[PDB]
Amino acid sequence: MSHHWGYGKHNGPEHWHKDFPIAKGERQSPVDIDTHTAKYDPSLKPLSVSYDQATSLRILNNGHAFNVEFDDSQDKAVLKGGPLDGTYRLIQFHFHWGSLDGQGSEHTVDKKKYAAELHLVHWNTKYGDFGKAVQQPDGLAVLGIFLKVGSAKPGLQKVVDVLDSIKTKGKSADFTNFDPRGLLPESLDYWTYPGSLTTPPLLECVTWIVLKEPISVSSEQVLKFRKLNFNGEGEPEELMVDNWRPAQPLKNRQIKASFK
Ligand SMILES: NS(=O)(=O)O[C@@H]1CCN(S(=O)(=O)[C@@H]2O[C@@H](CO)[C@@H](O)[C@H](O)[C@@H]2O)C1
Ligand SMILES: [Zn+2]
């Protein structure tokens, strides 16, 4: 591990366990979603996505992906219902994507990989702050949304057009008044299971909610993702591509479906 962990040959997912032993734990993410094995659970409530008062602040290239950050000091953008007990506040979203359209998602569906995957990260307000929440088995809820390449996603374009300004690791830009509702598909049908963060520290603190319906983005939109850099300014260019962890063993877990 050079600096530290990453997605390259010498510091990628196969290496992570040496510094983060929980990498080989009992509820690691992502996983393959076997649609024929997932069971419909009629006791699952509809998801409540309440993003009308969302306050985006900033977008950051963190050397792994880019994060769009939100004001989470109040209940402005929250996720509730579904498998969740209580209220989860949106803190950021980010993506994972590939070097080619046939790979890039972290979760897979009957072993199918999508071109990318969007993660909207939320923390359980009963734990007071994000740092405390990640130390709890029900601390986080991540809403995962698949991306396929086809027609453009209009609500994604504002994100795409600011990426030139955060090309390299550590760069940030003002990113206020962005509406994350524009990134959602029509349907909120989902699969859910207990899992983990998919990068180090790989903490097993996440209730995963993965939407069945992918969104479509254009080839031009995803091409601009692939022009980002893992490296910092003034360093040799390493294109930011294939920043996804592969599917992990399901072990003693059941994936539940919200839909028939
Ligand atoms: N893929 S996931 O399961 O949704 O987890 C991602 C990756 C890890 N978290 S995180 O700890 O909140 C996140 O991780 C860091 C870098 O990987 C920070 O740069 C950053 O401050 C950030 O808020 C979210
Ligand atoms: Zn993620």
Curated annotation (Swiss-Prot):
Natural source organism: Homo sapiens
Reaction(s) the record says it catalyses: hydrogencarbonate + H(+) = CO2 + H2O; urea = cyanamide + H2O
Leader sequence residues: none
Phenotype when changing residue 106 to D: Normal CO(2) hydrase activity
The keyword Plastid belongs to this UniProt entry's keyword annotation: no
Primary localization class, coarse: cytoplasm
Entry's pH dependence statement: Optimum pH is 6-8.
Annotated site residue numbers, Involved in the binding of some activators, including histamine and L-histidine: 92
Cofactor(s) named in the record: Zn(2+); Co(2+)
GO molecular function: arylesterase activity; carbonate dehydratase activity; cyanamide hydratase activity; zinc ion binding
Phenotype upon changing residue 62 to V: Reduced activity
Protein name: Carbonic anhydrase 2
Gene3D superfamilies, per the entry: Alpha carbonic anhydrase
